[PDB]
Every structure is written in C-alpha cells, then in structure tokens.
C-alpha cells in the first residue's frame, strides 16, 4: 500500500510514536521507483530477487 489512505506504513521510533512516513495521494512512488530503475540500471536484463 503506497500513497494510499488508511493503509499507511510507519517507521516511527519508540521515542514519541511520531511517524516518519507521510503520504499525500498526490505522489506516485511506484512510478518514481520504476523511473529510478530505468535510469540507473539496464532494466533490459531480468532479475529474480525482485520481479
């Protein structure tokens, strides 16, 4: 669940229960990661650790 509504992940430490992750529903992290891979690595080669 990326940039969703109620399903929000948290990385908050035990100190203050203050979540370090904010999602805006106006940001596309899936497409951002796809573009990041396509620009950094030669995506034409298949990898099996992740799909």
């Amino acid at each position: 669940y990326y940039n969703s509504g109620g399903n929000l992940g948290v990385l908050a430490g035990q100190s203050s229960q203050l979540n370090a992750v904010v999602d805006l529903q106006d940001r596309n992290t899936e497409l951002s990661y796809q573009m990041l891979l396509a620009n950094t690595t030669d995506r034409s080669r298949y990898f099996s650790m992740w799909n």
């Binding site: 509504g5 109620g6 399903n7 035990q14 100190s15 203050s16 904010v22």
Partner: protein
C-alpha cells in the same frame, strides 16, 4: 490541553513501561488514562479500515470511563531515582492509586 499525546498498547493483562531519554525542559506534569483499543481510531491516516466502531470515542471526545482501573504508577529518572524521591509520599517508592488489603 497542551500536551504530547502518546498511546501505548496494553496486552490484556499486567503492566507496561514507556519512554526513552529527553531534555524535559519546561515540563509541566503527567496526565494518564486508559482507553479501549476497539474504540481509539488511527491518528495519522486519513482513514481507519480497522476502526469498525461508532459511538463515543474516549481519545478525542473527552469521555474517560476507565480511569478507575489503575492500581499504581511509578515514575523514575534514569531508572535509578524516583522523581518524588525526597520522601514526599506515604508510599516511599511509587504513587499508589488503589489498595485492596
């Protein structure tokens, strides 16, 4: 109510122990109360898929009916010195709220 609201989950028994180090400048005191997990919603998210509850919400409605289920509370700084440690209370080492015997 000027405060930092912290919600610590409680398994349905026993006790619990919060909080790491901090500076504690201009501190004012502690306010403590017990709420039910079924009734407290999620704070950060705009939605709560796991809420499934209506009626009074103690967390954000000012409806605290479970304050009577506290036996005692103990406060220590650096896990060695009790905050009211200058022999202030009748009970030397902790705040007692209920005594049965």
């Amino acid at each position: 109510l000027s405060a930092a609201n912290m919600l610590y989950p409680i398994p349905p028994n026993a006790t619990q122990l919060p909080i790491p180090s901090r500076n504690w400048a201009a501190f004012r005191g502690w306010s403590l109360t017990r709420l039910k997990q079924r009734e407290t919603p999620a704070l950060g998210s705009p939605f709560d898929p796991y809420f499934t509850y209506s009626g009074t919400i103690p967390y954000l409605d000012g409806t605290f009916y479970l304050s009577h289920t506290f036996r005692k509370v103990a406060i220590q700084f650096d896990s060695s010195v009790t905050w009211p440690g200058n022999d202030r209370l009748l009970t030397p080492n902790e705040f007692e709220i209920k005594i049965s015997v």
